Amino acid sequence: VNRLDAIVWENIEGNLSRAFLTLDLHAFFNVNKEVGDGNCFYRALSRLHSESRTSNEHLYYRLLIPDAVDKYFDIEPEAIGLGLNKQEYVSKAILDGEWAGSLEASMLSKFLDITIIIWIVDDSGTIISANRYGEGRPSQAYNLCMVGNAHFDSLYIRV
């Protein structure tokens, strides 16, 4: 907590800032493992938005995407970078089990006025970098663990 809030992030593009660092994950966070149902991203947001610590709003968080697209997709560096078609993207993104991550963190951070950090973990479970979407500190952020470049778990910051 104390340490993570002292991190100066490097600004990169849009509301994305970045850090390179090695951390022992268990020393700084507790992890709630999410199920492998395609929804981990939205489960983690649901779980992190509230002290009751449940993932059952995951559908609702997913259903924010069309509206966030209307507001932001035309200007999202990742969408622009990858040359994604808006209509193609919105139709897929609302389906149950469709994966998500960096683009939806960028849109939703803004849409909900929150800060989302995806912490990247190597094969051994050591945090090797992070992407922060927003201007908040980690102690206030929605912290997610990215595993095997294919899944996220929720992080609770430790005390």
Partner: protein, 76 residues
């Protein structure tokens, strides 16, 4: 024939040769083959601006030894 750096997702730079009269996807393909990663899983920016597949490399103000940043598309 310009030499530049592409900083990878681990923060480490690798040297790529590039032609300002060629489009951005030429460099995508070079990175894709060399770093073993599909083109639709990453994008590139330069000085905070996203680079686009059919834009000419020369339009971005590239210089010898300048750094392009690789951005993985994160999905899970």
């Amino acid at each position: 024939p310009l030499s530049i750096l592409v900083r990878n997702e681990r923060g480490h730079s690798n040297i790529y040769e590039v032609f300002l009269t060629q489009t951005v996807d030429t460099l995508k393909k070079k990175v894709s083959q060399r770093e073993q990663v599909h083109e639709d899983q990453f994008w590139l920016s330069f000085e905070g601006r996203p680079m686009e597949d059919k834009e000419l490399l020369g339009e971005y103000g590239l210089k010898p030894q300048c750094t392009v940043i690789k951005h993985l598309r994160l999905r899970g």
